[PDB]
Every structure is written in structure tokens, then in C-alpha cells.
Amino acid sequence: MAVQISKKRKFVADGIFKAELNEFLTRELAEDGYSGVEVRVTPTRTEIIILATRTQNVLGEKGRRIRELTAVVQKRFGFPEGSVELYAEKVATRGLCAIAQAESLRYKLLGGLAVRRACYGVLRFIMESGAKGCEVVVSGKLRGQRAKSMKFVDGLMIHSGDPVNYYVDTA
Amino acid sequence: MLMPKKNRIAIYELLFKEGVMVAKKDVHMPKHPELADKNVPNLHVMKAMQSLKSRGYVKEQFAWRHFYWYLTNEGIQYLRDYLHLPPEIVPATLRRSR
Amino acid sequence: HVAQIYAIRQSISKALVAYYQKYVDEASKKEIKDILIQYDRTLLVADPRRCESKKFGGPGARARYQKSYR
Amino acid sequence: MGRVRTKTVKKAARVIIEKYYTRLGNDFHTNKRVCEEIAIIPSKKLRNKIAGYVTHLMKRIQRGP
Amino acid sequence: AIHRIRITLTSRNVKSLEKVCADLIRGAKEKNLKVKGPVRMPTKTLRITTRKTPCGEGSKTWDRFQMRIHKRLIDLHSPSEIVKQITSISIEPGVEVEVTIADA
Amino acid sequence: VTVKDVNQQEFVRALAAFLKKSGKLKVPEWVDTVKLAKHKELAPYDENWFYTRAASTARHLYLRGGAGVGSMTKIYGGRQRNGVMPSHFSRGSKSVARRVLQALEGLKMVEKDQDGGRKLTPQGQRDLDRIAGQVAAAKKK
Amino acid sequence: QQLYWSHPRKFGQGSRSCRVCSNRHGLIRKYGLNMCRQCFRQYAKDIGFIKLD
RNA sequence: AUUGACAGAUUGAUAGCUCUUUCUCGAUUCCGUGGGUGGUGGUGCAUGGCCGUUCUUAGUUGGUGGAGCGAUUUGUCUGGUUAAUUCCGAUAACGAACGAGACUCUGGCAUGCUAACUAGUUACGCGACCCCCGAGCGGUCGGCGUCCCCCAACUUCUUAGAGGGACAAGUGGCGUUCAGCCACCCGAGAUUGAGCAAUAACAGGUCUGUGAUGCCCUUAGAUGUCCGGGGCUGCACGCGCGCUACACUGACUGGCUCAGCGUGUGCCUACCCUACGCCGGCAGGCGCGGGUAACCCGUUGAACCCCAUUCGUGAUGGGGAUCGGGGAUUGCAAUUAUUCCCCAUGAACGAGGAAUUCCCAGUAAGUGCGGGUCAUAAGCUUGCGUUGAUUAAGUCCCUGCCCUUUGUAC
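The joint structure predicted for all components is written out below.
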């Protein structure tokens, strides 16, 4: 009530919250096409912005799933009623979002499509979407039972340096 | 239809009142977060929700030792049948959008 | 304690040079500066030397913990 | 015992001088600031390095091609 | 009323924080009153160092995870309405703002 | 001429002797028996040590004000051989620091300040600064 | 029945777990992180931490 | 149907676990079967992710073109140059991609600019307090403690922003007068130290980090789970990283006198950091205060060092093992000694065989203090500073690595 926790401990706990939510949203909106959560706290309110491809799927029928997720978030993290809201915005250039495209690769693999052909199509899609280059690694048991590994790669990459932090999207 | 009556039926009404429901995966919580009418702890809640899910009347997501139970449409009708409720009812997803 | 001495030793001789620069004339300063430098460059120009950080795998910066091998 | 210029310097220096031969001269800090304006060089260190070779070719040029 | 209102900006980001601080000075100069220039408080470095491995057995290597955090606090001699107009602007990044009333 | 103007080692030599000559301190019962801090192997070799550390404590209070007993234990801290384990800082003895500051309280060298802790009094500033003046005029050496 | 969990669970690692894996070893407890050091590296970036040095 | 029960016997138990008996939710049950579930069970030679290593070096790749029946090669190189497949330059290749470098963080220069009561204040003013505080007959000084706000004055010290700043640029050599190397001026001289980090590997480790996991196993008389207790600490012995020492360049007893990264409660499940006063020899105890912090702890009044002590090369006051008795605190509990204090006991050890590690500048080494774990709490670790060398500035002898030629029955 009159706590005002440490600047140190506050920022850590805020990040933790963001981290836990990112995961919960990753796990729940897996097939729906989750691409991120961009939270911002405000006066007597907490706007959190969900990023995804299929926005009609995340919102649900008429206004359902978003109301459930807000209620579960509300219930979970200890948020008073009407202090929080889930704002599902659409992802511009899905083919640059890696985590979207890793889920899309997960999906196709679960769909029983060939390890090569799905991954090759995933690669061609992201590269047509206008990226400097890309690097796809489906690993683990790709036929047989000795853990082989594919590595479908095209175009311009960077590994070493600071640049890689901001200049490559990893997933 | 199980166990202490007052407890179970208080869980089912909480799950109806709010369209979703959460716990924490912690077998030892003589209180439960929210609810808290009388003991009505974690477990009972946790084991009722697992009972719904098995017969098809609630869905699941785990994420960091916690649980998040989204309730089905076919679950709604089961709960209303269990609680002999009126057909109007309004569970939770009414909410004015714009 | 050793560090503090050299500091003042530096400071007082730098201070002097700054008094003469401002409130005498640059010719006297010039001779003063030369007298101190030919003695030691420490007097005015400080060391940039500073304590090098320890990295894991050893007790110091450079020293490594003893390899067992056998 | 070290500082050779990379190809990513040498090229930029070469291409600068082709175009803006006239602006560039013998003094370093003069053309150091010329390098800023005519070229979107990202790092200050890289700029400083390109210029430094840019002097050096200017010196070479001023003594046959 | 006029009172000694204190803004307290603290953030993990530097550039974004300094933009907000600068914007709060512009708003104060627009509606002229006072400022006492933005106080760079000494930045704290939240450090966590761990072994890179899960498990014991590789070579004994270590990550050094920093996390910094800054405080620009600005003072001001003004009423409340002007403060609510200024601080409502300069939001969207992760700059945590705490506006104290007077003195302490 | 003040105390800062004097070589502090030979100052407390005189102050302790000033504190003996006066003969109204209140050296407690223990003295002989007591250790002086958990640091120590032995008892102090000067058997009239209470006069010396009362002197050293006062001269500290002249320089740094507001010094509690906890402050006094920190000033007379040191290395502690665990013997076969590595050494660490132990703080000075509480009771003997306390018994000193009570002794200067009764002497009226000191007065317990606002915002807690001891600080020395003018009538004390007399003695301290007087004896500096005595030391300074011992000889040109 | 009454004795089921009934052992002083107030101090030491028999109490304190991670807020992700729940495994009760190698916890970052500093700044109230309360997470497996493996789980800490897992999330760190999101928490705001970063390797610069 | 057959969930849940004071006895009293039994039991470790105040486990309604069982036997005699009570009586109870009242729609829970019990039994199959399907079937789950759980698992710090097995499998890292079923995997993922994550680390580590080969491999801290300069390496690695395809397009098209040329050479070869082809595996392949060429590009990707005689030479010089570089820390560098770094450059120059050669040229059946041309023109690219990663890696290296650039980059990011850090270190040090800014009397330059922006900045401040949570910095200093900074020097003023001394408005002073203030007592002889001292010098001094008295004035004027010297010294701080502070009493200071704000309507004193700023940024030298401070904090941290955004800029500048060094480029082998200058002068001389040497070098195909290219790439470059050496020296010296100016002043930091390309070099402060990290971080990040390629291709291809490894059947390296990890299933005991995971609600990442396939298969296998087990599943109520459980490998599930909780409680009580013990164990991981057991000692003929063999090795590994450590700490303390073997003294007098020391020990002890006093005195003097300087740090830098941190951390801290009001919490994810029960509690932080602690100033000041009393009580206690001491470990500690009791009072009150401050502190979610440039505010309080805190000019963090650290150690080594420095200055007076003895002591006198005696296994000595060096060393501080082992061991008896007593007292504190943490704890639900400390015996197989949790830690702390105390009095006593006073071992080998008088510098270490063959062997072998680590390191070139604020470096080794000495020396303390923070973080981590942490109720209790470091001989470990990971950071911090303080004292501060000797020796090199090289070579391939050893050990390895990189390229070329070569040989090869691998």
C-alpha cells in the first residue's frame, strides 16, 4: 500500500513481469501467430500491446479471447479491475519477424511437411519480405535416429560485433 | 459432483463469475489467491479444474508454475447444468468494446 | 598514503605554475616549469597508470589459478 | 608494428579522393572535417582513419600519379 | 500557491531519458517559471555474474550481466495544473517518473 | 599554535602525562585483567594505558566530531589472526571505549552532542590546545 | 493429516525455489530475482540485463 | 455405496496406521478396463536448448569463368608487408559472402560547454557561535568543529550528459622510395583492458535447470509424496585446487594514518542495513533513532604500511595444529564438536626430493575490504581498490599452433 520498493528492485521486477508475460503469451498464442508484447504503464492504467499476424484469431469471436487474457493477466499479477488492457496490433512485414517465422516453421513441421521443403519455403518467404540475409537451422533427428542437422542459409549475415544485437532478428 | 460441497461449488461459481480462472502450482496454500471465503485452498481448486479439463469443460496453459484456465462454451453449459442456473446468466464475456 | 603524497606533490607544483601563468607573467612560469620537469615529469604531468581489472580464472588480472593437469 | 589500414578504409579514401580531389589537401584536420561532410562515415574513429590515409595519398599524388 | 515541485525521472535507457529531461525543460521555459538544471544522479550498475554452463563441467567461464539505471531529477517552482500538462507529455519509453509535491 | 601544528605521536605522550598529573579521571577496576580487544594476544605492556588511550580518544574527538563508542571501536580496529585461517578486521573493545568517554565526561573534556555521539567541550579544548602549545615550545627539533 | 507439510519451512533452500523451474539450487536471489541461474540466463535479456562487459 | 473418527492397547509420533467402539460428508465411494498421472528413475550413444573444446589462432565459403574422365582444383598466390587470407602487388580468373578489423562497454585528457540542498559547497563573506580554542600585552592572524539558511558566488574537486580528442598526422631515416617498419617532436604514440565472435566438427558435458523432451521403467505394500531418524562429514591409505607458516626485511603492546567496487528492510512468503546511549571483560544484551538510499549506515576513519614496544636466533614471545573446561548468538533442533568469545593445551614445520604451475606495467607478489551462497556463514569464488618489484622486449631448443613444399602401405 505504502511500500515504494527500491529503484533497483523495481526495475528488475518490471522486467521479470515483462519476461513472464512474454512467455505466457508465447505459449498461449503459439499457433495464433504471436510476435511480441510492448507494455507501457500510464496514469491509473496499463496498456499492453500484443503483436501478431492473425489479429482476428487473438481477439476472438466478437470480442472474447482478449477479454479472457486480460482477465487472466488481471487475476495473475495482482492488478485491480480496469487498470489493464490488451491491445492486439497487427505485425508489419511478418517475414522480418523471426519468432513469427520460427513458429511458422514449427507449424509446417508439425503439419508433416518435409524437413527440407517447409524450411526452404520459410527461407524464401522471409527473403522475399526484404531482409539483408537469413540463417535457418532445423536440427535434431531429421530421419534415422542419429541427430543430424540442416542449415538452410542465404544472403548477408553478421555474427560478431555489437551490430548483431540490433541488426539481426533471432528466434 | 465430488468432495466437500461448499468448497467445490464455490470454485465453480468463481470460474463462472470470471470467464477464466488461475491458481499457482503449489499444493500448500491454505487460502488460495482471491476467493478466500474459508480455507478453500490451492488444491480443491487445482484438482477441480483438472476434473473439468479431462471431461472437456475447461482448457489449459501452464507458463511459469501458475496455470491459466480458459473456460469452453461446452464447459459453460455444464457449469449452468451443475448450478441449475437461468438461461440468461451472463458469465463474463459481455464487455462493451467501442 | 604513498598515493596521497605524490598527489599533493603534483598539485602544489601545478598550482604554483597556474598562479604565475595568471598573476605574474608567462616568462617566469616558463622557467619554473622547466626547473620541475628536468627534475621529474611527474610534477606536472600525472601518470595515466591505473589498477587493471581481475578476470575470472585467476587471483589477479594476469595471474591464472594453478593448472592440475595430472 | 601494427597499424595497417583495412580495405574498408583504403577504398573509401580512394573513392573520396576521386570525387573531391579539390577540397582535400595536405593538412590532416582540414580534410578530416572534409571527410565528415561529403561522406556518411558512421564511426568517428573510421572517419579519422579514412582522413589519415586521405592525407597520405594526397602527399603521394603531389609527387607523380 | 506556488511551491517547490520536484520531478524524478529514472530509467534504464540513457538517450530516451535525456530526451524526456530536455522536453521537461522546454515545457518549463515555454510556461516561464524556473528549472535548476537536470541533476545527473550517479548511475547504479545492477550486476549479476554467473557461470556460463548449466552443470559443472566445461572450462570455468563466466558471463557478466550488467544492468544500468539513471536518475535525472529536476526541480521547479510552479502550480499543479502546469505540472500535469508537462509530465503527461514525454511518455511511451521506459522512463519512470515520480513527481514529489514539496521539500520531502 | 593548534594541535594540527604538532607531531601527533609526541602530543599524546604529553596528554596522557597531563591526565596522570591531574589525577581525576576514573580508571576502572579491570585495567590489569582486561584484554583491550579480541584481536589481542596480550594485555598492554604500558600498565598505565587507560591514560594513553583516553588521551588518544580525546585528540581524535578534537579532529573528528560526533564520535560515538561504535565510532571509537572502528578507530581502534585492526587485523585478527584466526591463526591458520586468513586474517580479518576486528573492531576495538566496546566497554573500554565507553569507560574512556565516560571518564572524559566526568573530567568535562567532553559533552554528548545533539544528533547523538560525543564531542569535546571548550574546557577540554583548553587542555588539548594548551598542551600543543607546550609541545611546540619544547625545542626547535 | 495435520502433520502433512508440518516441518519448519521458513529459512534455507527447503523453502526458496525458482519462480520458473522451481528447482531449488543455484538461485539468483539478489535484487529479488529468485530464479534458477540457468533460468536467469534463459530470460536475462527480457529482464533488462545485458552483457556489455 | 462405504469419504472422514477423542479412546485405551499398540506406536517414535498428540500417524484414527491398526484392534474395541464413535458415529459421519451424504452421492463422495470401492472394482475392472481403457486410461492417465507423477517421477533428483534409466538412457546425454534416442534428442532439443545451453555450455565447453578442437581453436584465440587466421581461418572458411559458394556464383560464374578456366584445368582435370573424375574425386578435386583454381579463385583462396612467388615475393614483401601486417596482430591478422592485414595490405601492396602479382595473376585463368572476375566479381562477392562470413571471420579479422570496424563495432559495443571500459581506462586515462579536457580551469571547454551543460549541471546541481540526495555533490562540493568552493573559495568568499566570515554573519557568526564558541570558549582562551591558541599565537600574542592587545590588534591581526592559524586551526578546525561546525550554526547557517537563502534573497552569498561558482564548478577547481563531484556526479554524468552531449561534444571534442590520436590519425602512425608530423620531422628524420629504412623500405620497389607502394604496403609498411624504426626512431624523435608535440603530447595518451598505431598497443588500457574486456565484450561480441566464422565454417566444419565432438557420437565433450548436461535427461540432477526446466510444465524442452522420445522411448524404456515404475506406479498404492509406489522409484509418487510427506513425516521421524541416520547418511553424503564414516579412515590402513593415494592424488587435486587451497589457507597458515617456518620468523627479527620479524612478533607482540601501544600510537599515527589513507581506499575503491558494492549491499541494504517494509520481499514470491518472513524477514534487511544499521548510527547514538546504557549493561557485560568478550561473544553479545537492552533501549531508542535514521535508512527502498549521491539523503541513513558513511569524511565507508580497511588492512598491509608508517612511528615508538619489547623480545634476541632458543621449535624462541616464531608456528597455532590437536585437546580439557566455561560462556555467547542462529535456530524446531547443533551430540558426530553450526558459528563467535574466553582461559588453558602448545604438534609437525628451521624454506621443501624427482617433479611441475602462473605471470611482462599498476603487471606478479604482498594487503585488506565488498558481492555470491547466507537463519546461522568462507580456508571457495567473483569484483574492488592500497603497497608495488625483478626480468624480457626475444627464439623456435622444449611444448604446441598457422601456412607452403614434400613423403606416406594411415
